[PDB]
């Protein structure tokens, strides 16, 4: 059928002439010089002045009709040559690469009105097909599904892809096999096969190191060697304090010349004997003097409302629960919601997190109370640990890992030779950690260990003195004794959907040396399987509360009841107002 090629162009460069040899951009003495099509005229070069100039020889560049329409924002075409040109080269029969850049010549509508006799193009565009792609942006509104370029498909609107960080965890959590029976570590004498290391699923090695470091020293100081840059979150993102905008005065955008919308005036001079006598002046002064009567032309913008809206949508809104979102139209999306593709393209309306939400209150968003907040792009520690590796996806690295196990690490070891063996994990969802908690296996992250070398630091003691301390440290009364900082047996009990009451019970046994109870609630999703080794049905790669201590469902408890044997109450003896039960929270107290 008869379909007409429509161009949307822009010619910013003023040259000297326009012939069939292109636009003239210079002179080689007597000979005129024309633009090299391979990279010239150049997109960034145009008028160097603000005021209005007629241009009778102009040129610019344009994308072909065989080139998909993409929004300008986020558009990238890799350079094809070292002169910064983008337009594609085709390898010819003779073996040489040949240029596809084609010139398109244009005239003004009045000039096209004539018979052609004095016709010369006033504009020339250098048309080329460039390998466009969008790396870091997607489509927020796709107007149409119609094949090939079109004006309806010019209606396409862009949105940037969400940030996703991936790194090694605080203190290399879970790289090592702690608390699994078959994959147990080994420390043993070379003069006697018997292992010093006794390990079970009850034990929680990671968490004892975490809470121990906290007890010892400040964790907001980040140290690279151990990857001891802790996870955290921004308080103003967790807790919204909505004070409203500091927009009190009107803020303005103005013309390039600070005037605009001008009218033409012809000067007049007074006849000095008459009360209103006047005479035209078109002699030394122009009869077409431009003057803008009244104020200059202007536009208004509210800075703080836009900034506050952008802050909210980027940092809170895209992280809302999936029940408040929808799927974009004329744009496809993964069926598996653990993909990065689903988190990135799901649409939440700005009206749920606009200016007036929670206004005059200090209040976290309710949908966000049951959302883990550590899993966020403003987590300084994960960002810091992601920058230790680098900006790139491909990273040759070197890392220094400590032994975190309490009995081993505070030990002083005397003369002899020893077997020391350990096991390490290679599963990406455990050794790496991602911001949105995406399944890394499926999303194609991979780590491949080269070498490993065990370092130990010695004291170079004098031999008489070392002999004397050895003689004393080898005596029966003088064995070394150690204990855990956690010192507790760790237990996880399953909670079905909407089950409000959780009773548990322990069979009869002895209770001397008991220190007390402590407890939280975790999620099944966020919790690796104990003694699994490898678990292909564990699809979450965020913060791991069982190991790293980031508990957040403490609020979801109502009251606790402690009962020894059949009816023996604890603490009891009428110690509390509710004597048999610790009531944590109460909906509207009146008492």
């Amino acid at each position: 059928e008869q379909q007409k090629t429509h161009v949307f162009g822009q010619a910013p460069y003023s040259g000297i002439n326009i012939t069939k040899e292109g636009i003239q951009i210079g002179v080689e003495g007597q000979t005129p010089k024309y633009a090299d099509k391979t990279f010239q005229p150049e997109p960034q070069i145009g008028e160097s002045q603000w005021y209005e100039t007629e241009i009778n020889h102009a040129a610019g560049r344009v994308l072909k009709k065989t080139t998909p329409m993409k929004p300008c924002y986020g558009s990238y075409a890799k350079p094809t040559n070292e002169n910064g040109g983008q337009g594609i080269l085709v390898k010819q029969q003779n073996g040489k690469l040949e240029s596809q850049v084609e010139m398109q010549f244009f005239s003004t509508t009045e000039a096209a009105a004539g018979n052609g006799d004095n016709l010369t193009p006033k504009v020339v565009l250098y048309s080329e097909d460039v390998d466009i792609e969008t790396p870091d942006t997607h489509i927020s509104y796709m107007p149409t599904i119609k094949e090939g370029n079109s004006r309806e498909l010019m209606g396409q609107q862009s949105m940037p892809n969400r940030p996703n960080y991936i790194a090694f965890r605080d203190n290399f959590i879970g790289l090592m096999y702690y608390n699994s029976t078959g994959n147990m570590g080994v420390l043993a004498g070379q003069a006697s096969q018997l292992n010093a290391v006794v390990d079970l699923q009850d034990r929680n090695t990671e968490l004892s190191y975490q809470l121990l470091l906290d007890s010892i020293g400040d964790r907001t100081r980040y140290f690279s060697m151990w990857n001891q840059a802790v996870d955290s979150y921004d308080p103003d993102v967790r807790i919204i304090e909505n004070h409203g905008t500091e927009d009190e005065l009107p803020n303005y955008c103005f013309p390039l010349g600070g005037v605009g919308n001008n009218s033409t005036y012809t000067k007049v001079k007074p006849k000095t004997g008459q009360e209103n006598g006047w005479e035209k002046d078109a002699t030394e002064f122009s009869d077409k003097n431009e003057i803008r009567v009244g104020n200059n032309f202007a536009m208004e913008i509210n800075l703080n409302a836009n900034l506050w809206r952008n802050f909210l949508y980027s940092n809170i809104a895209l992280y809302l629960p999936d029940k408040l979102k929808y799927s974009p139209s004329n744009v496809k999306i993964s069926d598996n919601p653990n993909t990065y593709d689903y988190m990135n393209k799901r649409v939440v309306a700005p009206g749920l997190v606009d200016c007036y939400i929670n206004l005059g209150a200090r209040w976290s968003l309710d949908y966000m109370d049951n959302v883990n907040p550590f899993n966020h792009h403003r987590n300084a520690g994960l960002r810091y640990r992601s920058m230790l590796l680098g900006n790139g996806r491909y990273v040759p690295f070197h890392i220094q890992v400590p032994q975190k196990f309490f009995a081993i690490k505070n030990l002083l070891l005397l003369p002899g030779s020893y077997t020391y063996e350990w096991n390490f994990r290679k599963d990406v969802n455990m050794v790496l950690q991602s911001s949105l908690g995406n399944d890394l296996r499926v999303d194609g992250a991979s780590i491949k260990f080269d070498s490993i070398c065990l370092y130990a630091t010695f004291f170079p003691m004098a031999h008489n003195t070392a002999s004397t301390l050895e003689a004393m440290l080898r005596n029966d009364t003088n064995d070394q004794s150690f204990n855990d900082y956690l010192s507790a047996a760790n237990m996880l009990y399953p909670i079905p959907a909407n089950a409000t009451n959780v009773p548990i019970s322990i069979p009869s046994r002895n209770w001397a040396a008991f220190r007390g109870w402590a407890f939280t609630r975790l999620k099944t999703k966020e919790t690796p399987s104990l003694g699994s080794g490898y678990d292909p049905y564990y699809t979450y790669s965020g913060s791991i509360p069982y190991l790293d201590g980031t508990f957040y469902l403490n609020h979801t408890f109502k009251k606790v009841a402690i009962t020894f044997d059949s009816s023996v109450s604890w603490p009891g003896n009428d110690r509390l107002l509710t004597p048999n039960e610790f009531e944590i929270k109460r909906s509207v107290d009146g008492e």
Partner: single-chain antibody
Amino acid sequence: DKDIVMTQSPSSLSASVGDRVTITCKASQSVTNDAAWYQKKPGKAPKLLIYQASTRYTGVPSRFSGSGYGTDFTLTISSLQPEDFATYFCHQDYSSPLTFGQGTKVEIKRQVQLVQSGAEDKKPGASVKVSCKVSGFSLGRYGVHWVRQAPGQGLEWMGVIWRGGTTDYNAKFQGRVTITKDDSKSTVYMELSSLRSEDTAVYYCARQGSNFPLAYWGQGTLVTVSS
């Protein structure tokens, strides 16, 4: 940008003083309003008569006139005089290669300077270089052409070097034509390589108007090649 066969009829013509003469030119694919008519004496260079289907070049006599459109064009001598015994050429500048006819023959019924280099001859596969000194214009203000005329044949457009230095050659010569120029010495060089006996011809420097044909011609250079 393809070959256009310019067919001129009658092939020969016979005339006496005061005769009205009619010559016709048929293009094999359309040249729109762009047929140009030339008059050539057998011993001298081509002279421009008519361009754009009907216009007379500066100082051409009034007994000449042209007419026509698309494929069909006409050359009319209103009442022929004794200078009109010549051989006439059809031409079009609607494409590159530029093309002429085979020359028709009219027989009896019984200021700018371009000076080329002197004549010579050579043996097959050998190379030749001809010069064309220019004066009365500068090389950067207008492109300069090369045409050749064989004894018996028509006019063969060989190539061109345009004002800026973009060269374009006739595809028949398989890259044997090469044109160079010195702007400062105001001279154009034509170098032809791989000679044949076919390349035994007179070789012409030419230059066109602003946006219409060849009107300034050299004195011709004879190049001959025989075994």
